[PDB]
Symmetry: T
Subunit: 64 residues, 12 copies
């Protein structure tokens, strides 16, 4: 059985790096992370100093 968590990673560099930011976080606290699906991408301009790329991913991990 796989379970997914819906995480939004951020990066001042790229959409790929923002995806990696989310996946890194998942791998910090979950075992057996197996894949991630991009579900949205955006750029924060107003709330930050430099543009921040955001990539939202469903991160899948195997239960048990």
């Amino acid at each position: 059985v796989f379970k997914k968590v819906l995480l939004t990673g951020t990066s001042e560099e790229s959409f790929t790096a923002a995806a990696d930011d989310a996946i890194d976080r998942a791998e910090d606290t979950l075992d057996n992370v197996v894949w991630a699906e991009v579900v949205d991408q955006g750029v924060e301009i107003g709330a930050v100093e430099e543009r921040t790329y955001q990539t939202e991913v469903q991160v899948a991990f195997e239960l048990d």
Copy 2:
């Protein structure tokens, strides 16, 4: 990194109040709730005494 939880709030008053019901629950148990996105709305008629408005939200909270 933000994480989202998918909650369905309920209210006998309104779709806005049902959204608030879900968000209140998130704020009870999570720190740093930052935003919510409505993903569905419905009305339960059969299983309840009065019509109950339901608003499903992705509630986003900042990790760490």
Copy 3:
């Protein structure tokens, strides 16, 4: 077996009241209305005197 009818309710007050308008109509002529799903919301401005909120719902009712 459930069947759905696709109704658009209207209200000069709110999206929730427009949903109720459709559901009330369904309950007038159908037995065993069990739930409604919101599928669209809009506001008529041009064809009416006051703004009219419209909420389109699939209203589900149990057959037999």
Copy 4:
């Protein structure tokens, strides 16, 4: 010919009032606003003092 502008209204009261906020703005600067379609709804929790309901609408207006 109709044209649409994509506006996000805000309200500390309700999703309907947030829709009205956007429509009011359109009517301030455009002639012949005819209808609005809801395309998204959300709640800002982090960037504001009280929860702020947001309703994004395509507001249609007749050209000429």
Copy 5:
């Protein structure tokens, strides 16, 4: 308030059995599981010995 978890069940028999696999897992660790919504179905052919049917479900459970 309902919460949903996004689980992918697997079965060498059928899409229905893969849905059951996910739901069984949810019921092992959660109280008050109330419904599940199918959101995707697929078949793993390469990574497995026999074809494995996968059914991804949002499993809803009542909080409190």
Copy 6:
């Protein structure tokens, strides 16, 4: 001209059998049922004794 009715069939056995449940109902009361399109599938767990698979279908029938 074809017309569609939106029916949700139910079965304690399978998603296919739930689709058949809806189609059987359509064929009971309609002439010239020609095809059905699956639009959603779900599982009721809370309101029933055994899990009940539900398959929502648009059932198309030829008018005249």
Copy 7:
């Protein structure tokens, strides 16, 4: 309150004429037909002698 019926019109001439075919049928049996929304278009090639254009429409009519 508006209600919609989901009809597929057909024509050996054009997608517009197939839409008209469905709308004509609705107007034959319903009062107060007000608008139609195209939801799908297709072409039957195998089951017919000449290509037949099909346009599926939600046809809206005012109740009461």
Copy 8:
């Protein structure tokens, strides 16, 4: 850089002519119109004398 404007053209003749109506309007006031994407089609029956076909298009034009 391309920008898009969301226009709904109308015609008493056809969906293609309604698309042309919107595109003609764009070309009246914009330079360097490059393409249009159909995003919706509908038919007004109630508010008009003859049926009026409507085709909503994103019309893209090159900036600078």
Copy 9:
């Protein structure tokens, strides 16, 4: 078993004729073409002399 190919036909006349352009091409090289589903429509304005209507279709053909 049916297979689909995703083709974009073009016409200086109409969306229906652009669909026919794609279907004609499929019928030139494939046996047992059975149906086509419209998946997108657009208009090329910049790259061509006269406006060119484009209709993208999934064209289905029976294998064997």
Copy 10:
């Protein structure tokens, strides 16, 4: 690099068996079939003797 082909399998038994029908066909003529994604399911009632379940799948295979 993976490539996908869009196949509709058929079965008089079940949606799972219809998916298998498509996948079997892919495996007959393609090497390195790795996974399949369900994209639609339907039931043919009019054109056949017994109901025929159809499951449309994107079947992925590794190139080279």
Copy 11:
């Protein structure tokens, strides 16, 4: 009130840089640009010398 403009940026380097191209253009002519949402990405191969990555974004800016 926020308003969105739908811009397609281009880059011979990356999807992120194409998003930046659109956002830069928005910031040239608009005050109070606050965020951007990616809505499509593509690659032009035929009309250009080197591959050109395109990223279409809704760019949001605060009115007043």
Copy 12:
């Protein structure tokens, strides 16, 4: 007439490079590749040594 093939490219570097991987493959075996549309992006974590970015594209090529 354009035809599309649905390819998933892979890269240990970026989503853009994974898109390029698919497009390169198309250009190896097809003439007159004209554009590509991104339809999905993901990251393989479990089946590989380093994270592998995957970008699925519809690659369009002109027939004849």
